Coordinates of C-alpha atoms and ligand atoms in Angstrom, one line a residue:
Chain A
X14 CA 0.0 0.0 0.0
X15 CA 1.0 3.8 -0.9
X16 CA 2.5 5.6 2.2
X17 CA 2.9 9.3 2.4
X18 CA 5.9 10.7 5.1
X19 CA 5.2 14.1 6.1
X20 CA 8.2 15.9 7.3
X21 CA 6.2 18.6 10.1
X22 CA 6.6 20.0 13.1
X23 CA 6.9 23.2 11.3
X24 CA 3.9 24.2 12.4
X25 CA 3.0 21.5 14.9
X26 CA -0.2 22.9 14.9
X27 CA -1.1 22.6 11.3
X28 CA 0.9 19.3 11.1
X29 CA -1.8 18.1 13.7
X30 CA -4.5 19.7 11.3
X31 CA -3.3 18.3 8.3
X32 CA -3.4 14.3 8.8
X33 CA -6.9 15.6 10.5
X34 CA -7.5 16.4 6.7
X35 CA -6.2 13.6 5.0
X36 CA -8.9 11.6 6.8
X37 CA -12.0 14.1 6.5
X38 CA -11.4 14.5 2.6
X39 CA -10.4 10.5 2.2
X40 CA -13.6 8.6 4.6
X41 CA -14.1 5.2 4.1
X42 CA -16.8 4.0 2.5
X43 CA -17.0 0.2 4.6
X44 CA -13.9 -0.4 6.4
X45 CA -11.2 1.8 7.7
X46 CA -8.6 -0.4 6.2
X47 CA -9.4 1.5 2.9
X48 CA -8.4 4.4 4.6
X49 CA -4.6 6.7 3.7
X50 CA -1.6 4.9 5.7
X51 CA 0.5 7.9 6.6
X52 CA 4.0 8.8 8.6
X53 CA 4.0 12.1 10.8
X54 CA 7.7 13.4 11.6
X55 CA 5.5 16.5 13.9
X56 CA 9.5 18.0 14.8
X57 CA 8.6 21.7 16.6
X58 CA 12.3 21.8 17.5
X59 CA 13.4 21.9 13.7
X60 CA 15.2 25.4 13.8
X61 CA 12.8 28.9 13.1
X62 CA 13.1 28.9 9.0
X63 CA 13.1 32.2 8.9
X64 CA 14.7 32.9 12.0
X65 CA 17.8 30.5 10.7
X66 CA 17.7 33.0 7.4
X67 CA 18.1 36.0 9.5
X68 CA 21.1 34.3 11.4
X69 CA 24.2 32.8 10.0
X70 CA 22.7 29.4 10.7
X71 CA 21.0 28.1 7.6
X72 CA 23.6 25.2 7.7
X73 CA 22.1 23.6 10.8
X74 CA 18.6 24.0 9.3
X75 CA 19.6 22.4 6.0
X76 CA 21.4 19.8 7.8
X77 CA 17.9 19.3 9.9
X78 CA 15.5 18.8 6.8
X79 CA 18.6 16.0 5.0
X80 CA 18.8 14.0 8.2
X81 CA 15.2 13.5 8.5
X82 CA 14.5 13.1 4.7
X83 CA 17.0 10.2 4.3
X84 CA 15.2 8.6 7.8
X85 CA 11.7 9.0 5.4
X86 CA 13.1 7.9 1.8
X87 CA 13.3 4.5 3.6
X88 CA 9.9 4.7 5.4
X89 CA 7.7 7.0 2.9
X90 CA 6.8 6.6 -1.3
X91 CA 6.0 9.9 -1.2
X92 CA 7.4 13.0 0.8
X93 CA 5.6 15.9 1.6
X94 CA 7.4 19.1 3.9
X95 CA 4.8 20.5 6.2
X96 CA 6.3 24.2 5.5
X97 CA 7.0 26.6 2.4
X98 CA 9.7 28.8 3.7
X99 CA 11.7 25.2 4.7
X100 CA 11.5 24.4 1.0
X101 CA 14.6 26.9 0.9
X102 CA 16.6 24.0 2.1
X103 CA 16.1 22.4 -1.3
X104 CA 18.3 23.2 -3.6
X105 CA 21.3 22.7 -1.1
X106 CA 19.9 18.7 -1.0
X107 CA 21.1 15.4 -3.3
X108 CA 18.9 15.0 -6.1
X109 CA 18.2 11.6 -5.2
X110 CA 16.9 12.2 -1.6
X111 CA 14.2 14.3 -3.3
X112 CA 12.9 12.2 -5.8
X113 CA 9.9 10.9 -3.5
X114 CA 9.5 14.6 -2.6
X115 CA 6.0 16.5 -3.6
X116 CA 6.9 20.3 -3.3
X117 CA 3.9 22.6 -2.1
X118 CA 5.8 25.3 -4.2
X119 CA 4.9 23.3 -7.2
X120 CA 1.2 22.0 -6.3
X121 CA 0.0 25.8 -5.4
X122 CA 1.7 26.3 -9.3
X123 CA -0.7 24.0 -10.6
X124 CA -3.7 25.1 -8.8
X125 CA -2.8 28.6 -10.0
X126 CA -2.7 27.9 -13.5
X127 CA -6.1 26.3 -13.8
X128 CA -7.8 29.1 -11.6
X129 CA -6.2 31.7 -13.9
X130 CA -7.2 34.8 -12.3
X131 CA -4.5 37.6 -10.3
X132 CA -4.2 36.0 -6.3
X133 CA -2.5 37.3 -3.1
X134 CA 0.7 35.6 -2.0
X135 CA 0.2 35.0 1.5
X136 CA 3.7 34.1 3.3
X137 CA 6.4 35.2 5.6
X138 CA 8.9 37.3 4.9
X139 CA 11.6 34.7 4.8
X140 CA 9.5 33.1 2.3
X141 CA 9.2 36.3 0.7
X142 CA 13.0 37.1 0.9
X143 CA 13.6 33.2 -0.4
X144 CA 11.0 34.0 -3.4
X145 CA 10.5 31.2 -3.6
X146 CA 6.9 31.6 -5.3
X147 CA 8.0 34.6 -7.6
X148 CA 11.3 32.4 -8.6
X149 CA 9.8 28.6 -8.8
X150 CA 6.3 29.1 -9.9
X151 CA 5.5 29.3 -14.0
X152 CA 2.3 30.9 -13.5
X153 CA 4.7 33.8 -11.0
X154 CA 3.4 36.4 -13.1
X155 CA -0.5 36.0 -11.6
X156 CA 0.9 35.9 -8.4
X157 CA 0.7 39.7 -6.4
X158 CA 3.8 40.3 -3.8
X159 CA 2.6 41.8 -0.7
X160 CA 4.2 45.5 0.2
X161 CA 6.7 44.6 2.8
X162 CA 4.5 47.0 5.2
X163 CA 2.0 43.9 5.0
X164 CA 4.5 41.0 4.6
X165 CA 5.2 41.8 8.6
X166 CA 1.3 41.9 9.1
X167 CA 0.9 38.6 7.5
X168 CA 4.2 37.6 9.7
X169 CA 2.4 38.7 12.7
X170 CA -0.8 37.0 12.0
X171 CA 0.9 33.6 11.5
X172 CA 3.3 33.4 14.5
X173 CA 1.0 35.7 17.2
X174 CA -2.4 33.6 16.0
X175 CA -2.3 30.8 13.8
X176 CA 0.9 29.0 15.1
X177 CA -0.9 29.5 18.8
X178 CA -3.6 27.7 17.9
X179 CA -5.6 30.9 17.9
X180 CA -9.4 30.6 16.0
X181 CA -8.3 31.3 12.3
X182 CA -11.6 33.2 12.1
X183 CA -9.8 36.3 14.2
X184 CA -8.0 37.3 11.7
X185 CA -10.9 36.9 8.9
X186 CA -11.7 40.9 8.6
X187 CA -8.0 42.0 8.6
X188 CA -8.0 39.3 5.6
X189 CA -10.5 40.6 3.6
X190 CA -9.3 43.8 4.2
X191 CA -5.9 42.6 2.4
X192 CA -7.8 41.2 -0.8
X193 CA -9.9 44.2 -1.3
X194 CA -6.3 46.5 -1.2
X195 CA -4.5 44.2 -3.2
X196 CA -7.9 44.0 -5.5
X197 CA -8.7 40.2 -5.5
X198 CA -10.8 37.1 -5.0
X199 CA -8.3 34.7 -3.9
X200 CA -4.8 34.2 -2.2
X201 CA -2.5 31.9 -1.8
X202 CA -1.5 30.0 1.4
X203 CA 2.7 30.9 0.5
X204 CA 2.3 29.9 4.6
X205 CA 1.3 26.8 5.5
X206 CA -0.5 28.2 8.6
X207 CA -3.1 29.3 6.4
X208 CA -4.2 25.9 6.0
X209 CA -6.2 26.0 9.2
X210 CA -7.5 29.8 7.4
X211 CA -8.6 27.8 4.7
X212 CA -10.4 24.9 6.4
X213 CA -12.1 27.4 9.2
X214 CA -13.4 29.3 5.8
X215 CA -14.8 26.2 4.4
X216 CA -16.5 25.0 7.0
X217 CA -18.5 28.7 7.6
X218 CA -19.2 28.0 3.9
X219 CA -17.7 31.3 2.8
X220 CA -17.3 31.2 -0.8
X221 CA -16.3 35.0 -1.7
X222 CA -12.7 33.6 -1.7
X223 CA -10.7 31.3 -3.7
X224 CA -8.1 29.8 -1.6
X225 CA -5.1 28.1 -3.2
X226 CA -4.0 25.9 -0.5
X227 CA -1.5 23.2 -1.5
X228 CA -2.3 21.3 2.3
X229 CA -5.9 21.1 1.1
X230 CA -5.1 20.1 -2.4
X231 CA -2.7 17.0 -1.2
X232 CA -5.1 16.0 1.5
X233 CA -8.2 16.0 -1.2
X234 CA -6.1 14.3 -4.2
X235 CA -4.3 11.7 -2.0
X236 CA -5.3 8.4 -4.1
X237 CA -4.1 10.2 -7.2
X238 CA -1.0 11.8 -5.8
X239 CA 0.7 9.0 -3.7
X240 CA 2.1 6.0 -5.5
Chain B
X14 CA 15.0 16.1 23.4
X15 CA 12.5 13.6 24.2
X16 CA 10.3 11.7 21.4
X17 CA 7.0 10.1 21.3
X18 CA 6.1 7.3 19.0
X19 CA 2.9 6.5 18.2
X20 CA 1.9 3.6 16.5
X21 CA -1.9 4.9 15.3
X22 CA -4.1 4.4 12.9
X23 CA -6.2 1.9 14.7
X24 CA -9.1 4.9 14.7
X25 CA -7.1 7.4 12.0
X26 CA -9.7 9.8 12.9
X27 CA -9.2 9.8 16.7
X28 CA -5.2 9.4 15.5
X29 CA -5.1 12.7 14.2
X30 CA -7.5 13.7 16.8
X31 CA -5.0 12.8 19.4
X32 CA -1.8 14.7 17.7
X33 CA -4.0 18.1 17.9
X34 CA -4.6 17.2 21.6
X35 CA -1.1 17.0 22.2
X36 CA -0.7 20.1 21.4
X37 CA -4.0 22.2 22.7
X38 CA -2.5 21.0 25.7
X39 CA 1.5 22.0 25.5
X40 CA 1.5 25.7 24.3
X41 CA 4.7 26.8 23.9
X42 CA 5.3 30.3 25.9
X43 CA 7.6 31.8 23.5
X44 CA 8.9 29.8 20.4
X45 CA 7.5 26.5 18.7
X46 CA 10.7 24.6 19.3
X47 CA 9.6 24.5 22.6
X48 CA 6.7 21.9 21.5
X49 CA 6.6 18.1 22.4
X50 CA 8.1 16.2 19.1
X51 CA 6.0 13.5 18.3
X52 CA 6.6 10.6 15.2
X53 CA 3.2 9.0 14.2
X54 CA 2.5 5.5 12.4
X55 CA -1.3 6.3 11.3
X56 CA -1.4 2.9 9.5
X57 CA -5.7 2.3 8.7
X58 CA -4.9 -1.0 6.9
X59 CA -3.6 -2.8 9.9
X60 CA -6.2 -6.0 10.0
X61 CA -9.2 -4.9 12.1
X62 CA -8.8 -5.3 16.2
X63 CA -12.2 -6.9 16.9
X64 CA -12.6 -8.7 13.4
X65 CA -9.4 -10.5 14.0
X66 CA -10.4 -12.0 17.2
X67 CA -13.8 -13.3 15.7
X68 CA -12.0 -14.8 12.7
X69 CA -8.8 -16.7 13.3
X70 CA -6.0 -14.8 12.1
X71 CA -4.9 -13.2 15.4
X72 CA -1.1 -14.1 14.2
X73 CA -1.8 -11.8 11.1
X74 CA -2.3 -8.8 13.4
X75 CA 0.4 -9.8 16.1
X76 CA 2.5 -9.5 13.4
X77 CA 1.6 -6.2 12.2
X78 CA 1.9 -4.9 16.1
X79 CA 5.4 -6.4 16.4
X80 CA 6.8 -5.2 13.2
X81 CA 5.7 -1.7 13.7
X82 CA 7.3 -1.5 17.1
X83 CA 10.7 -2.6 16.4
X84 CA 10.5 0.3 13.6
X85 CA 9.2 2.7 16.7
X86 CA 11.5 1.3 19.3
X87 CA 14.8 2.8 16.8
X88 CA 13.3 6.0 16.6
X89 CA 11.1 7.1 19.9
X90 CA 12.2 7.3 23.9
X91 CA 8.5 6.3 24.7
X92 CA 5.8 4.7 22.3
X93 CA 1.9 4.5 22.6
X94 CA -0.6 2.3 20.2
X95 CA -3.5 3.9 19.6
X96 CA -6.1 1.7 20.3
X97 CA -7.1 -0.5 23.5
X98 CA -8.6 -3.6 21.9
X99 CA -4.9 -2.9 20.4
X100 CA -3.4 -3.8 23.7
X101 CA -4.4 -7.6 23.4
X102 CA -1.3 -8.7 21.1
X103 CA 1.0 -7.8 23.8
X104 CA 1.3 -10.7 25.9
X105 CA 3.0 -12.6 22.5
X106 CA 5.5 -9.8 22.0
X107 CA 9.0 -9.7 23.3
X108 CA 9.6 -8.1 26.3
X109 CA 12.3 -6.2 25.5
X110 CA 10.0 -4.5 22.8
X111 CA 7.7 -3.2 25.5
X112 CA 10.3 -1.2 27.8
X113 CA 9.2 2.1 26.0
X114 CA 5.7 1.3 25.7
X115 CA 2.9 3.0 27.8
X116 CA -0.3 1.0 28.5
X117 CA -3.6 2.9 28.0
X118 CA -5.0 0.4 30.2
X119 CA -2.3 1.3 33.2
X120 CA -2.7 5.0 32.4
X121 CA -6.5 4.5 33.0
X122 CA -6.2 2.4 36.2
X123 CA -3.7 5.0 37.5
X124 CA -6.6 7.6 36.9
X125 CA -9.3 5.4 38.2
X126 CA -7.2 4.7 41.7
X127 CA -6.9 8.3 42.1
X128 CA -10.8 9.2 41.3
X129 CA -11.7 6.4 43.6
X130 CA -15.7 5.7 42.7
X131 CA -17.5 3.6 40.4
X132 CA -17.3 3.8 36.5
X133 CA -18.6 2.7 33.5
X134 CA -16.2 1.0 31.1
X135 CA -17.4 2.1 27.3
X136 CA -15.3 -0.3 25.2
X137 CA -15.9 -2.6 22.0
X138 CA -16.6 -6.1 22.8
X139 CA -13.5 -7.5 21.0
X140 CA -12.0 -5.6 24.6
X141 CA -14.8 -6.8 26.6
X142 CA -14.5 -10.5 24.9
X143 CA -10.1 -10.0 25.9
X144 CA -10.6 -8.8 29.6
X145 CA -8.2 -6.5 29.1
X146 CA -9.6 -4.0 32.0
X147 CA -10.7 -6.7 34.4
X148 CA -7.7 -8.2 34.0
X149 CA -5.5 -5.8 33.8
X150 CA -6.4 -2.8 36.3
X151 CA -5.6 -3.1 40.2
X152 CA -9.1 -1.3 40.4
X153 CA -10.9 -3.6 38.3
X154 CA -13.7 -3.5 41.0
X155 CA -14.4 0.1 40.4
X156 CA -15.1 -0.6 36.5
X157 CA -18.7 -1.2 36.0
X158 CA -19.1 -3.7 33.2
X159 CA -22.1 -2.8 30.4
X160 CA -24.2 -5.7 30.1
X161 CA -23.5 -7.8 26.2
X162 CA -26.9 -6.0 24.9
X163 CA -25.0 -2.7 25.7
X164 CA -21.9 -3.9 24.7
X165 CA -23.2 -4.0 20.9
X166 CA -24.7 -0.5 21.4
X167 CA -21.5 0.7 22.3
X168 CA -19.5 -1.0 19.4
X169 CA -22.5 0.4 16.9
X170 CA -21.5 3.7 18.4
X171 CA -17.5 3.3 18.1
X172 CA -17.7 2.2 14.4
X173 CA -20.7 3.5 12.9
X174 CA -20.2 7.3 14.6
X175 CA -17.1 7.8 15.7
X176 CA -14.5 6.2 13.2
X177 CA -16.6 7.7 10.6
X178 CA -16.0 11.0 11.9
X179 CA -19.2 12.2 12.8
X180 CA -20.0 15.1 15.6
X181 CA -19.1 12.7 18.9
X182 CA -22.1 15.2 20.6
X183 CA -24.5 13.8 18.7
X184 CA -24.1 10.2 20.8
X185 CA -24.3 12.0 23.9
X186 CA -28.0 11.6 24.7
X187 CA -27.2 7.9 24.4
X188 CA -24.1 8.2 26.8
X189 CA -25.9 10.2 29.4
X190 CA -28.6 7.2 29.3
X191 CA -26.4 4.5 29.8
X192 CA -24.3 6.2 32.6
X193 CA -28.0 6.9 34.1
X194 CA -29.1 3.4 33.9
X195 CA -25.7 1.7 35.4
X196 CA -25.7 4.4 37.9
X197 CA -22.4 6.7 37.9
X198 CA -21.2 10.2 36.8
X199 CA -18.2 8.9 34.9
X200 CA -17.0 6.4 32.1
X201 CA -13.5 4.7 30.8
X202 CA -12.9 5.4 27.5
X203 CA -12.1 1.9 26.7
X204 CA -12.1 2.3 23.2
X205 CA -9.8 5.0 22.3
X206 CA -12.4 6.8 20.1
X207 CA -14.3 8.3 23.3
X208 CA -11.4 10.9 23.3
X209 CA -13.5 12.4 20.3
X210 CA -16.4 12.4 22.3
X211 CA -14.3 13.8 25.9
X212 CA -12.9 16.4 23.5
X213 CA -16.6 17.3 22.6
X214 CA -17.3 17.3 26.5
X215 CA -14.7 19.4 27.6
X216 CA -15.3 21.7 24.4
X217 CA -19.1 22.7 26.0
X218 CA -17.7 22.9 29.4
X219 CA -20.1 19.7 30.4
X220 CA -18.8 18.8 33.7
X221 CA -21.2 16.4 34.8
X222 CA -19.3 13.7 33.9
X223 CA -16.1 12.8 34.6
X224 CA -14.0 11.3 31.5
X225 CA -11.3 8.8 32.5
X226 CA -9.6 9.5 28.9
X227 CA -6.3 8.1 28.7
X228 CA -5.3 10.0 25.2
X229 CA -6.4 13.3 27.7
X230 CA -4.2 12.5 30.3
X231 CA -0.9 11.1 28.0
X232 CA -1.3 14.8 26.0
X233 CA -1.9 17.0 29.2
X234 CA 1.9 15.3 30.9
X235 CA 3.6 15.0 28.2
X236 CA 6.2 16.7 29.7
X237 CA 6.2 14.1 32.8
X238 CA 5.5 11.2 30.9
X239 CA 8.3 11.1 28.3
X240 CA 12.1 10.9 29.2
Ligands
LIG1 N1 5.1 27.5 8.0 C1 6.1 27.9 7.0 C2 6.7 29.2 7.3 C3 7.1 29.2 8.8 C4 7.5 27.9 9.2 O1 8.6 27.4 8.7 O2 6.9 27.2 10.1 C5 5.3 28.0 5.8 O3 4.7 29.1 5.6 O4 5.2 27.1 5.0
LIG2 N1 -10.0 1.7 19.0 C1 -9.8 0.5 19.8 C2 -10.8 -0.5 19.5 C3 -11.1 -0.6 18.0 C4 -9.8 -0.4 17.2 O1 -8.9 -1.2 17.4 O2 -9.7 0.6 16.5 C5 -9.9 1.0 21.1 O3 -11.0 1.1 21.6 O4 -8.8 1.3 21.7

């Protein structure tokens, strides 16, 4: 049977809310046998990713994500890292420990293209500084950067709320707010954290916004994605 | 730093369910590295608990339990499965794969000892059918045993609600009955999958009964438990 590692922690909260969404968007129809068989590396003590940019010390963060991907290639068929801004790490790894490896980069790409419409990068700044969005994604062009006034504001809102465990409701209005400024429908979840935005916006059954969340999408597409 | 294995899946939903409690309970004051780290084996497609007892191939799932722990053993300081009808393979496993391993069913005798009056046992009948309270708890005269007609009610419960992932709430009419009828204020969650419904409680701030939940009580000292 197909077995996806999740490399988390990086965000213990979402982690948590994550394989809580593998299950709600996969239920078994008879038996939970049919059910997704998953690994959970839920790591908090992985190094701050942006915090390590800041620093000198982005050596002992890469050196975190290679340990625990060559513990997973062993374990895992597939690979999924549980944060954008530690996808950074990447081009610094072998090849061949990321051929498993499902990059949210890439998945939100995807999502993008088919929507086709002009959506809000949410992230943190060391994501933002990485670019990893503007620099890896073909459809970067539909993408719009936050000012770096509001990358901080979305930087608060992730570590003061959402990585607390805060509701992801609070900080509805000061979203809505950001779409109408930046002039759009949608945004992207650049921030993992956003995940539990996302599934606190689905469940109210608000529809006004598109949200491009790669956590969602993997969770939803799991029989396809995981060979 | 200290790590948790869980060996899950046995109840994916109240798996993932679990891993969110682990953290509700252990906010970190300043920084997320501060977090318990936590490695999860949600594994669905391990042979059913119950269903393996009432056909013959107990060896099949002995297996699984044994294999998965030796994996666990390399990688966590303490380990916990997920599931109490779970518990019933130990006795065939080698000792020496046990030293990290934390009973649920010592965790709720603990408990039990220190609430000190009766309580109603809420298990599936493949636990009920093993003994695994009665013979295993130094209180076991404390536990009130359902009759077999309530036994079935409960397992219909367990499998048709909870595991399904259903609002746990809406079997608590049913609950309040039953610990009406037997005559106490609190229950064992003897099938791991009433930590969905003492999550539920605790959510409404319904103090009227007292949940002897040992998924509650592993998440809230985590910090004692694990070395
Ligand atoms: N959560 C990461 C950024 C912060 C972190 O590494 O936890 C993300 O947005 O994917
Ligand atoms: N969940 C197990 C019983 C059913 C199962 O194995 O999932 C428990 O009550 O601990």
């Amino acid at each position: 049977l197909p077995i996806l590692g999740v490399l988390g922690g990086m965000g213990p909260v979402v982690t948590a809310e994550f394989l809580k969404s593998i299950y709600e968007y996969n239920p078994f129809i008879d038996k939970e046998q049919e059910s997704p068989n998953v690994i959970v590396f839920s790591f908090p003590s992985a190094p701050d990713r942006t915090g390590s940019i800041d620093s000198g010390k982005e050596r002992e963060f890469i050196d975190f994500i290679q340990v625990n991907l060559e513990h997973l290639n062993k374990l895992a068929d597939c690979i999924v890292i549980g944060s954008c801004t530690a996808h950074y790490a990447l081009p610094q790894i072998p090849e061949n420990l990321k051929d498993k490896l499902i990059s949210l980069i890439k998945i939100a790409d995807q999502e993008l293209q088919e929507y086709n419409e002009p959506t809000l990068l949410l992230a943190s700044t060391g994501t933002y500084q990485k670019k990893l969005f503007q620099e890896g994604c073909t459809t970067a062009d539909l993408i719009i950067s936050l000012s770096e006034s509001d990358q901080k504001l979305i930087h608060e809102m992730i570590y003061k709320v959402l990585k607390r465990g805060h509701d992801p409701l609070s900080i509805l209005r000061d979203i809505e707010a950001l779409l109408e400024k930046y002039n759009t429908r949608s945004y992207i979840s650049g921030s993992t954290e956003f995940h539990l935005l996302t599934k606190s916006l689905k469940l109210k059954g608000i529809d006004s916004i598109k949200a491009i969340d790669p956590l969602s999408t993997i969770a939803q597409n799991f029989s396809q994605l995981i060979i």
